[PDB]
Amino acid sequence: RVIRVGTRKSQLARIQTDSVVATLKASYPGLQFEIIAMSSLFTKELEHALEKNEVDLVVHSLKDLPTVLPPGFTIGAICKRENPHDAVVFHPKFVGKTLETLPEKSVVGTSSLRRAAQLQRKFPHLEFRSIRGNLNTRLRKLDEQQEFSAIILATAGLQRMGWHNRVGQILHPEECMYAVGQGALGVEVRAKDQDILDLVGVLHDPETLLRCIAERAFLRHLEGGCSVPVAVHTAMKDGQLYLTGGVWSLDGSDSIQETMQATIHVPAQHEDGPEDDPQLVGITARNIPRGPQLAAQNLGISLANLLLSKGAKNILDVARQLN
Numbered sequence: 001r002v003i004r005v006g007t008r009k010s011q012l013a014r015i016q017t018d019s020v021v022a023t024l025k026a027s028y029p030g031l032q033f034e035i036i037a038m039s040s041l042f043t044k045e046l047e048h049a050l051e052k053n054e055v056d057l058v059v060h061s062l063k064d065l066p067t068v069l070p071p072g073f074t075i076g077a078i079c080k081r082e083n084p085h086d087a088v089v090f091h092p093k094f095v096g097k098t099l100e101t102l103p104e105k106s107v108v109g110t111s112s113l114r115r116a117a118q119l120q121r122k123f124p125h126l127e128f129r130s131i132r133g134n135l136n137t138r139l140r141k142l143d144e145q146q147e148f149s150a151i152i153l154a155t156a157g158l159q160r161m162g163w164h165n166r167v168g169q170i171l172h173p174e175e176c177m178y179a180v181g182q183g184a185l186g187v188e189v190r191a192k193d194q195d196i197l198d199l200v201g202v203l204h205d206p207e208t209l210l211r212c213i214a215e216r217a218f219l220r221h222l223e224g225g226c227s228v229p230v231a232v233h234t235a236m237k238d239g240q241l242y243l244t245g246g247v248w249s250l251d252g253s254d255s256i257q258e259t260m261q262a263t264i265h266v267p268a269q270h271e272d273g274p275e276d277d278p279q280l281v282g283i284t285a286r287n288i289p290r291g292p293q294l295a296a297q298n299l300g301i302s303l304a305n306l307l308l309s310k311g312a313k314n315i316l317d318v319a320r321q322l323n
């Protein structure tokens with residue numbers, strides 16, 4: 001069998017897929033890999049090819065995969081996270097500036113409700129208006145017109161394009177927490193395909209795996225739906241897993257944010273895990289110890305429950321109906 005890899009045509013999707021194939025080819029230099037390019041939600045188009053056996057794995061940005069995947073598919077590999085933080089690209093005239101030092105009423109472009117909500121609260125002296133198009137078009141709207149003084153986007157996308165040099169400012173968590181699963185890639189496969197699941201299991205990075213299980217379990221337990229201001233921050237230091245999560249009204253004046261930790265050790269050994277284990281928030285990692293995997297899910301759930309008892313659902317409901 002030749003391992004067929006499906007991908008979207010867009011530039012960033014192509015670049016992400018190529019980097020995943022490169023990592024698989026380092027582990028499996030003796031196998032052939034073909035990359036098949038194909039044509040508000042694009043995932044189900046790739047998912048249709050995956051179930052009908054026209055491709056065998058699809059590479060996604062993990063934050064584009066909902067917390068509930070269709071029952072026949074699973075995330076079989078959580079690759080090592082790149083830089084997860086949000087970044088600012090400034091207008092050529094504003095080189096050397098920050099969001100704080102931009103003149104008042106400078107327009108900042110972003111179509112992310114999560115970014116607009118957090119940044120309108122942290123920088124009330126700036127307008128945040130929607131910016132439309134792909135990364136290449138957004139950078140041309142920034143350069144050619146004088147509508148936008150800056151645009152907001154994810155660092156990882158700029159880096160994968162090789163455009164690190166256009167990054168003016170990296171936003172820290174206290175300014176802007178990143179989206180659930182941002183900076184990590186997810187390999188999505190048929191749920192009952194033992195062979196592909198075993199092959200891509202080599203891509204699993206234990207720390208990104210556990211960190212993303214907490215972020216996705218936290219996100220799913222709030223049941224806020226699609227396109228709502230939820231942001232997270234994870235870190236593992238000293239055998240502890242830290243999960244900070246927050247919810248905001250669309251405009252940023254309403255916010256609940258809390259942090260909780262748990263003792264969860266990062267596993268270094270691989271194991272031959274059971275074949276009938278259920279997926280955790282759509283993730284199958286049979287070669288990583290499941291104990292820490294469940295504890296990470298338990299951490300996300302506990303923090304979501306804490307936020308909910310402090311009024312998180314009503315913020316999510318106003319934000320949803322105001323979108």
Ligand SMILES: *Cc1[nH]c(Cc2[nH]c(Cc3[nH]c(Cc4[nH]cc(CCC(=O)O)c4CC(=O)O)c(CCC(=O)O)c3CC(=O)O)c(CCC(=O)O)c2CC(=O)O)c(CCC(=O)O)c1CC(=O)O
Nearest residue numbers: 061063064066067111114153154157179180183225226227
């Ligand atoms: C109900 C529901 N649907 C989904 C899937 C889903 N996730 C998002 C978040 C998202 N995606 C993008 C575009 C993007 N994807 C990757 C990159 C590069 C960086 C990387 O690889 O991580 C980008 C561009 C970039 O971030 O710079 C955005 C940005 C939109 C913008 O800038 O204009 C976002 C929003 C954000 O980051 O805060 C979406 C939204 C797509 C959009 O254009 O708004 C969707 C589909 C949808 O909302 O309908 C999820 C998973 C969300 C998650 O895990 O983070 C859910 C939640 C659930 O299942 O309950």
